[PDB]
């Protein structure tokens, strides 16, 4: 399948990304608390449901939430301000809370069942969010080595996510609060002056430069 691209809602961020986040890829956003990672997730969960002429893929969403940060209210706000029916947008997001890192891992296998169900329908899964990818792993496991449980488990988790992205033509979007080179694409996000958010690609020798955007009632915008 050709690579599809989901607009972020910001023309600046989209240009930085070459049109939007890609299917058959893991895009990892990382940054400090308050940098807008979860806002970008909420925005993408709406944007992907738009038709391609408006920057979406007419797609469904699956969302694995490890910090209790998914907000249906925020989805409804973004949806109505982007011309969609909030009821429909919520209906096409399949949501699960991950209890711990082991449950988070199992949820990826659970997700595959519904990805297969929807694969040849009018609304296939096009976006899988894991927010936060790493919070449970960092809380539960202390050791840094390749042989340590944290790395072994996270490596398997990331390989599982990769597999889904490429097998089923899905954009996988994950967040990480500040191994490191696993994601197809790493984006560093920070909060700058006047509530502006600034994005930079990390180790992607794609456009040099930085995107700037705002958090608004439309999710994100220039």
């Amino acid at each position: 399948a050709t690579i599809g691209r989901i607009s972020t809602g910001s023309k600046s961020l989209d240009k930085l990304l070459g049109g939007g986040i890609e299917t058959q890829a893991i895009t990892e956003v990382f940054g400090e608390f308050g940098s807008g990672k979860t806002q970008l997730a909420h925005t993408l969960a709406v944007m992907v449901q738009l038709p391609p002429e408006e920057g979406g893929l007419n797609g469904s969403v699956m969302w694995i939430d490890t910090e209790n940060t998914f907000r249906p209210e925020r989805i409804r706000e973004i949806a109505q301000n982007r011309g969609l029916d909030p009821d429909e947008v919520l209906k096409h997001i399949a949501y699960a809370r991950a209890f711990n890192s082991n449950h988070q891992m199992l949820l990826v296998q659970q997700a595959e069942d519904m990805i297969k169900e929807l694969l040849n329908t009018d609304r296939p899964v096009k976006l899988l969010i894991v927010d936060s990818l790493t919070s449970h792993f960092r809380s539960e496991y202390i050791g840094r080595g390749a042989l340590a449980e944290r790395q072994q488990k996270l490596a398997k988790h990331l390989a599982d996510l990769h597999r889904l992205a490429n097998l089923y033509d899905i954009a996988v979007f994950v967040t990480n609060q500040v191994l490191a080179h696993s994601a197809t694409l790493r984006v560093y996000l920070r909060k700058g002056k006047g509530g502006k958010r600034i994005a930079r690609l990390i180790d992607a020798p794609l456009p040099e430069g930085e995107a700037v955007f705002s958090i608004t009632e439309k999710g994100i915008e220039d």
């Binding site: 249906p72 096409h92 399949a94 949501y95 659970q110 997700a111 519904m114």
Partner: peptide, 4 residues
């Protein structure tokens, strides 16, 4: 998973 459940609808949101």
């Amino acid at each position: 998973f459940h609808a949101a």
